Design an enzyme around this catalytic site. Structure first.
Site, mmCIF file in Angstrom:
data_model
loop_
_atom_site.group_PDB
_atom_site.id
_atom_site.type_symbol
_atom_site.label_atom_id
_atom_site.label_comp_id
_atom_site.label_asym_id
_atom_site.label_seq_id
_atom_site.Cartn_x
_atom_site.Cartn_y
_atom_site.Cartn_z
ATOM 1 C CE1 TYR A 50 -4.369 1.196 1.585
ATOM 2 C CE2 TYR A 50 -3.209 2.869 0.839
ATOM 3 C CZ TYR A 50 -4.470 2.474 0.787
ATOM 4 O OH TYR A 50 -5.136 3.546 1.188
ATOM 5 N NE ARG A 64 -7.778 15.413 4.838
ATOM 6 C CZ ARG A 64 -6.985 14.223 5.159
ATOM 7 N NH1 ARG A 64 -5.746 13.640 5.058
ATOM 8 N NH2 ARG A 64 -8.106 12.867 5.218
HETATM 9 CL CL LIG Z 1 -8.948 19.752 1.982
HETATM 10 CL CL LIG Z 2 -10.991 14.778 5.987
HETATM 11 NA NA NA Z 3 0.676 -0.917 -4.042
#
Ligand SMILES: [Cl-]
Ligand SMILES: [Cl-]
Ligand code: NA
Ligand SMILES: CC(=O)N[C@H]1[C@H]([C@H](O)[C@H](O)CO)O[C@](O)(C(=O)O)C[C@@H]1O
Ligand SMILES: [Cl-]
Ligand SMILES: [Cl-]
Ligand SMILES: [Cl-]
Ligand SMILES: [Cl-]
Ligand SMILES: [Cl-]
Ligand SMILES: [Cl-]
Ligand SMILES: [Cl-]
Ligand SMILES: [Cl-]
Ligand SMILES: [Cl-]
Ligand SMILES: [Cl-]
Ligand SMILES: [Cl-]
Ligand SMILES: [Cl-]
Ligand SMILES: [Cl-]
Ligand code: NA
Lengths: 670, 670, 670
Positions: C85, C356
């Site tokens: 991942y 964010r």
């Molecule tokens: Cl954002």
């Molecule tokens: Cl978020």
């Molecule tokens: Na991958």
């Protein structure tokens, strides 16, 4: 004297005007043909045009069409690159839950030697492809027979395949079996799990699950005690409901109505169901697959070893309950001569079938449609003896879109001789046929890509492909070669893939746009280290590290080896030897045979000060077949210390006396 | 006030008009220069133009030309990506039977340390390239000397190469040898095989076979008894006929006239013929190869270690019968100063030679032609002291097409200082010279691609390439670096390729169209897993499987190991140990040294209930250097059970008594 | 009736005119939008346009912009392709001495299981990328806790990183540590080395060296006796001068003034300096890095587990002398709700910070600037609740250029619900914000590429990236998935990367031009065998050979094995076993259990004629747990030959008598 310009009407001979435009234009200018078709007497420098099509009669009377770059929105990809003879996607490709599958056979020849039915897959709409997966092992009776497959597809969430057994010696069919397996899926469901009090089974409601008893099911978040983790199907109630055995029971009924949970199925952890159909009579090959409905499907076939040929399909109306029950339906007799390997697909109640023609000098490929799953047909013949190619296809709107490839350059046309035993650049074509008009007289075969035919052997891996649609794109997966000879006529008559460049055939995919793409591009340039097949990471000490399990089956030569701690909470390093027996031995030394031996040591170095040692001396050693046992204790546990033979060998000798023997009784002398 | 537009005449200063067009045009518009050349005072944003050439005097008085995208139909490829210092294609490339060969040297430095003469090959007209092949091993007297090669090519179906031996310490030449080998081929022939009655040899008619006694030949379908399978050449009658020894004889003459059959030759299964030429006097390097005819060839050379320099060629008029016979031919003396590494090619009776200049401040590269294989010459000097680059070339129509690369940015021009020890973007150029006009005063060097020079060491792998034509394309194979430092000044003064990013030099190929391409494109995007170097297949159990034989020569650390059944109809697993002796030992444990030991077992587990065991205890074990032998029988076969020394060790002890000893006679006590 | 043409003014509804142009134009024509923006009611077939931007309100009131090909000069690359991942470049990327670094975390999930902090690098301005390097090992207390990192960058020639420890169970932070290491460099210097007579140390003048005691330094050509080869820093005098200990001393002072020499540093051969900061209170994650000056830097942070949130930075004013000293500076309180993971960069005395947003239904991402390293701020809110994405950015001229990605399709807009558990094509955007105008009301988010969100699990690896500028290009390194399910809901709930296709998240890089490129293109098509991760060369005998050291940590199955001579001038082959103990054992045979055994031999074959043998018989053998010792001498060295137990086992037996015993004294019978 007036000059004419290029007309682009497909009829006027535009050769002179195009030659003058080329001569008068810089070589780097992209000359835009405005989407028109230009008739020429030979192909000009196609590379200097964009958005142009040419029509040209290489053979008088046989116009074919030739695309410059950008005339079609399409692109060729190379999708395998392995030393096997990788060919014959025919006619197995499919799309399932967003993944494009390109099954094929990887062998060492046109035959079943060294063959595995294989696939590669794309998870990104054809930009990149996976490491090959073997779907079949070598048959248990290899090297007499081995597997083969040209028909595979999906019905109600199961993969179905006609797995044939054929002889290595002659590629003769000896058995047909239907193999099927559930496809891997993750389902995100609400409710549907009940478990009655005071017993251990739970009933799982999954519409059209396609599972059988013994198939793998994984549960998460079920909110039903005991329905958790990796499980298997205990019973199938009906097509929408099955049960599992849980480890426990509760005094209250359980029901996860209204609750969200997750189920997973697995191709890999479920067995194949294998239904032996025997040697189906009057069959040479089973080829192509058409899903009909939620219960069954059709598979194409032909018989071509003896007269009269047959071409048709086998319809399996209920492959779930009755995998051994099928009905044979032939195309009309006039279309069976010189024909093989039909491609079949089913759309809106109509079964379409397109044949391969076997000869350039006799009537070739034909197209057939049926509204009763092959009991009756309407038919047409493609002009000009289309031959040596299958014509896999899909239906998009009112058109069939079909693809074919000549196997070597200049074979496509009627009357053209085979062109083998020299390198060439075979043409790949597509065409559209409007099903309402139902007339192929006017068909336009458009050369969209050229392949290589290597020429070192007569056979070709070019073409014989398979077609799928995903979204707004059609995909033709097919073979092509390169210029690297397999050296069959040469140092590799045994056809070992792992010598030199192996076999030149590999798979390609032509991705063609067939409707609007209403998103910004997903395209990328691939700049990564490919790190799936042999995953390598530079560790914190700067050494390439592969964490994946792997099997090396070819002969290995190793240098210095360290066996790391790995087993039982990493307490030990471990080597296990398989077979009836293991053998650890010592080559004859090249430079000093007199030293031949192996030193086994319980410590870190060749000096016996580091650990107990046993040294086995080779026959070539000066001390031939000596054994030296060197420890600070020699303890013989569990058994008497005996000579192998009776009254033949001694304890000690006159120059190797033991000081004494410590005994609990006098010696027994006889 | 009127404004001027861009004139594109190579003389008007178009800087202002181009700046205004750039300012007034969206950045994504491709500004078409209509194939014209625009004089500028500095290079504008080249990326925004198509079909444009710029002329610019970075150094006043020295115009050079700069191509936007699409001005030439051409493209750069990266063709190696290995940790060795991969450089010096000079001047070895060739095309043989549809395959493009890019030979080079992969070393650890500008020198012969760690060096293998190598190649990569393309089977698809340059789109993709093969896994590197080593053509030479390390010399038997490594690390004192090792091989080196800058001259290789093909004459009458054999590869010929000048394999030099040079010192590691100073790269000084110590020996020259001509090595040659038949190229691999498949031939599809009719007739030509005869076998006289009552003897065992067959005569094989193959024009210009190029084989010697002992070379490999494979036969299929010969229709001549005993001429079958893998064989070797027994005699050479003449250049068109050889014999083979068959295993048998017939009472009738045999002749396969009119019958089609197949022959194969093999580079890999034929030995090199090696002709020692000694230390050829007055030679520094042998470089470049020109096939002359069916019998021989020329190789370039220079002497540059002491004054006076020589530059010229060695002509081998009959390399087949007389590989040790050659004649030295120098270029005119005025062109020998400051010159090296000539490139030579032969076309239509004319030998062309182009030198490398060694200095930017003295007259540089020069071009020479001869109609008598270098006895007499006509010559010209390129303007502006072209230096530090070889100029490999081909003749296409009336033009020589030559390629060169500066080794670091801004070195090309006369008077420009070397620019080392910092990263930069060196320019690669090509030029055309019309042989009828025979005048380089007006030559136009066109910058078609830029490379990277890394800057971590003074030397550069950029450039020093080789050129071939195949069909309608010319190919320049040459070196380039990347920004990854080799850490020679750093943690890798030893120059180990396998540390960090190894060495930054790798090979590239610029593929340029030089005549019409009358076929639809063969181009593809490569989307496959590269699966030739380490072929991996996911087996039916989901495990990555490599079926190819492999050698791992670097130190290996392994985890859990299982040795599978592999040998003698798979009855056994097998490990063989090479060397004078093998050693299997046990590291000092890091956490519990007191446990140091190896358990050897005839069964599956560490419990002795699974099989007989011998356990060798390490010196660090609490039971230091113990051996425990644990079986249900201990049977000593073929020899007495003896102490190593005389009258020093015992049978048993007071706390380890044997119950008795079973003897056929009383003990012999002395 | 008049028709209108497309206006391209961003306001007129151009849908009808574009539809008519598409209908009336051949599909292969590239329709040039002339750099204009066209308002549409739904996106048309974008693939048919070049140099066009669309504005479209998928959600009324929320215009977003969509780029056709070539509207921006930019391209997407795929830069990792590994089974882990691979996600979260956030916010670690940097450029150092011409190399672009893309650090990330490779795990098995959104969590620290199986996690290594990793990077890939580009040495060619983003065209190709390196084999992944692990920067961290698994934590010593794995599987309870493991490492994590979202903040990394360079200050004064050292890498600095905030290495967090987090729980596997909940991803809860348990420790913060500052780790730092010198970056590898080669320096080409003149003078600066002095060595006083009659002592052993030398002083090295290297401005801003960034080295600590114990760090690696390599010297070449120093012209100072004893300052040579691989050394280490003995003392640091000041930021510009350090000393080394040489092996010797001279009677005269030495000084290399005026002489050119070379120094190298090494990341790999220098230890980390690790400064434990403890569990910094009120911190959830440390994220992003802004170099401030020659002495220190800032790292972003947020606290989001409990109310009230914090968002801000930690400033380390002198990380060299005082790595444990930092000051916490929060953004204004109004901007802290629903906010996390700030990106921070410092340019011309101004610290910029972008948050964010955590929710699409509350005010989202905001932008802040400070001229006092976060003590005071000016702030603005982006319109429309930008959420779920970090907004990494760089400043180029007067603009911030920022990038973001929705995590699944159709999540970007205010009020849009999360869209998980089904496959989709998330949009990636960039925008420019002029810092003088300081107003985001009018911001234009331009969709430049689309990714895949796989849908098999709720979490997404798409996005959460990092941005750098190199030269005239900006680079956004970020995650994207493919359609291959990880089978978490399925047969891989354990999340083993090495099963099937592993995890779909991998890294990509969007390379966008942001100023003129005044050189000819460096671009190439990659056609090489990737030969860095597992370097393979076909040896002169035709066998794939890997010369690099490697570690295989996964379970291995091997076929026939030969252990080659490798050790002590190649006299021996060698296997060393690690752990407390080694075990070599024998599986239970599948077909003939009665044969279970291992034959150990000092010669080349299973026949005892080839060498001494010991054969250990398994418990399943007919001769259960037998041992046969077969040599022509059996010599017991260094110890008595004893039974393990006292007065339990015998020498010989009645059918296995020794002929006699040679003793130096009578038996001791008790
Ligand atoms: Cl954002
Ligand atoms: Cl978020
Ligand atoms: Na991958
Ligand atoms: C594979 C194997 O078991 N080989 C064994 C052979 C065979 O039993 C014998 O050749 C059968 O005919 O016998 C020996 O050489 C022997 O008795 O001295 C020992 C050797 O280990
Ligand atoms: Cl094929
Ligand atoms: Cl068929
Ligand atoms: Cl056919
Ligand atoms: Cl056909
Ligand atoms: Cl192990
Ligand atoms: Cl080079
Ligand atoms: Cl030379
Ligand atoms: Cl030079
Ligand atoms: Cl030169
Ligand atoms: Cl084996
Ligand atoms: Cl990510
Ligand atoms: Cl944060
Ligand atoms: Cl070894
Ligand atoms: Na390299």
């Amino acid at each position: 004297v007036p000059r004419g310009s290029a007309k682009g009407d497909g009829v006027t001979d535009d050769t002179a005007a195009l030659t003058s435009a080329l001569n008068d234009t810089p070589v780097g200018q992209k000359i835009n043909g405005n989407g028109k078709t230009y008739k020429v007497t030979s192909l000009p420098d196609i590379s200097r045009f964009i958005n142009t099509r040419f029509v040209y009669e290489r053979i008088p009377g046989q116009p074919l069409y030739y695309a410059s770059e950008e005339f079609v929105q399409g692109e060729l990809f190379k999708i395998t690159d392995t030393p096997y003879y990788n060919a014959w996607p025919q006619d197995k490709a499919f799309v399932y839950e967003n993944v494009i599958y390109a099954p094929y056979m990887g062998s060492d020849r046109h035959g079943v030697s060294r063959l595995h039915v294989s696939w590669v897959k794309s998870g990104d709409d054809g930009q990149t492809w996976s490491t090959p997966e073997w779907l079949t092992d070598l048959h248990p009776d290899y090297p007499t027979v081995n597997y083969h497959c040209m028909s595979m597809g999906v019905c109600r969430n199961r993969l179905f395949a006609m797995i044939e057994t054929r002889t290595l010696a002659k590629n003769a069919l000896t058995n047909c079996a239907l193999w099927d397996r559930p496809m891997s899926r993750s389902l995100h469901l609400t409710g549907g799990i009940t478990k009655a009090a005071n017993q251990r089974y739970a009933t799982i409601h999954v519409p059209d699950h396609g599972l059988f008893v013994g198939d793998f099911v994984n549960f998460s978040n079920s909110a039903v005690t005991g329905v958790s983790g990796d499980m298997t199907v205990a019973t199938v109630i009906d097509k929408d409901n099955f049960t599992v055995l849980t480890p426990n029971q509760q005094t209250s009924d359980l029901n996860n109505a209204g609750k969200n949970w997750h189920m997973g199925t697995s191709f890999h952890k479920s067995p194949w169901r294998k239904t032996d159909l025997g040697l189906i009579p009057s069959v040479t090959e089973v080829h192509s697959f058409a899903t009909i409905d939620n219960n069954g499907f059709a598979m194409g076939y032909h018989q071509g070893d003896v007269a009269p040929r047959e071409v048709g399909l086998f319809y399996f109306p209920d492959a779930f309950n009755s995998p051994s029950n099928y009905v044979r339906r032939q195309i009309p007799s006039e279309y069976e001569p010189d024909a093989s390997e039909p491609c079949i697909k089913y759309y809106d109640g109509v079964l379409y079938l397109i044949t391969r023609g076997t000869r350039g000098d006799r009537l070739g490929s034909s197209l057939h449609r049926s509204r009763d799953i092959g009991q009756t047909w309407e038919s047409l013949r493609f002009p000009h003896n289309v031959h040596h190619t299958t014509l896999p296809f899909a239906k998009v709107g009112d058109d069939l879109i079909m693809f074919g490839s000549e196997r070597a350059e200049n074979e496509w046309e009627a009357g053209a001789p085979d062109d083998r035993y020299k390198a060439s650049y075979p043409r790949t074509f597509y065409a559209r046929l409007n099903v309402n008009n139902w007339n192929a007289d006017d068909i336009e075969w458009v050369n969209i890509t050229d392949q290589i035919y290597q020429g070192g052997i007569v056979n070709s891996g070019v073409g014989v492909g398979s077609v799928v649609v995903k979204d707004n794109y059609i995909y033709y997966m097919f073979g092509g070669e390169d210029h690297f000879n397999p050296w069959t006529y040469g140092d590799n008559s045994a056809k070992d893939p792992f010598k030199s460049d192996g076999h030149p055939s590999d798979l390609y995919c032509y991705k063609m746009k067939i409707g609007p793409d209403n998103r910004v591009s997903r395209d990328f340039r691939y700049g990564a280290v490919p790190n799936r097949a042999v995953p390598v990471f530079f560790d914190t000490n700067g050494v390439r590290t592969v964490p994946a399990p792997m099997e090396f089956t070819g002969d290995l030569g190793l240098g210095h080896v360290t066996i790391r701690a790995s087993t039982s909470s990493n307490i030990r390093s471990e080597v296990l030897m398989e077979g009836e027996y293991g053998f650890i031995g010592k080559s004859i030394p090249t430079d000093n045979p007199a030293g031949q031996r192996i030193i086994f040591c319980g410590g870190e170095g060749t000096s016996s000060t580091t650990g107990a040692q046993i040294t086995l001396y080779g026959a070539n050693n000066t001390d031939s077949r000596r054994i030296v046992y060197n420890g600070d204790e020699h303890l013989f546990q569990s058994a008497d210390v005996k000579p192998y033979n009776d009254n033949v060998t001694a304890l000690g000798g006159p120059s190797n006396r033991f000081t004494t023997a410590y005994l609990g009784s006098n010696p027994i002398v006889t």
